C-alpha cells in the first residue's frame, strides 16, 4: 500500500535522503530510523530510548521521547500523518 | 544494544 506524507512528515524523510513523494510504510519506517540516526536522536547509553524535544520530529510525534520498544506515538504520529493512496 | 539494531525489530 502507498502512503503520501503529510508536508512535515515529507520534510523530515527527505532531511534523512528520501527522492520520492509517494512511499510504503516500509519506507517512511526506514527513513525515519535513518533521520534518527543521522540526528543523533537516539539515547547514547540506552539507545532504544529516542530524545525528540527540539527538534522537529518532536513536533510530530508531540512527545519530548519515546522508546522504540513502546512505539506507539510513533505509529499514531504515522496514522496521522499519512495519507493513503 | 545499538540503536540500528533496536529499530530493525520494529513491528511495521
Same mark, same amino acid.
Given at each position: 500500500?502507498?502512503? &503520501?506524507?503529510?508536508?512535515? /512528515? /515529507?520534510?523530515? $524523510?527527505? !532531511?534523512?535522503?528520501?527522492? *520520492? *513523494?509517494?512511499?510504503? !510504510?516500509? *519506507? !517512511?519506517? &526506514?527513513? $525515519?530510523?535513518?533521520?534518527?540516526?543521522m540526528k543523533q536522536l537516539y539515547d547514547k547509553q540506552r539507545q532504544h530510548i529516542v530524545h525528540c524535544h527540539d527538534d522537529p520530529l518532536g513536533e510530530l510525534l508531540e512527545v519530548g521521547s519515546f522508546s522504540?520498544? =513502546?512505539?506507539?506515538? $510513533?505509529? *499514531?504520529?504515522?496514522?496521522? =500523518? /499519512?495519507?493513503i493512496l | 544494544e545499538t540503536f540500528s539494531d533496536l529499530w530493525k525489530l520494529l513491528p511495521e
Open positions: 500500500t502507498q502512503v &503520501h506524507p503529510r508536508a512535515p /512528515l /515529507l520534510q523530515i $524523510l527527505k !532531511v534523512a535522503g528520501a527522492q *520520492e *513523494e509517494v512511499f510504503t !510504510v516500509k *519506507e !517512511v519506517m &526506514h527513513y $525515519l530510523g535513518q533521520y534518527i540516526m522504540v520498544k =513502546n512505539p506507539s506515538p $510513533l505509529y *499514531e504520529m504515522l496514522k496521522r =500523518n /499519512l495519507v | -
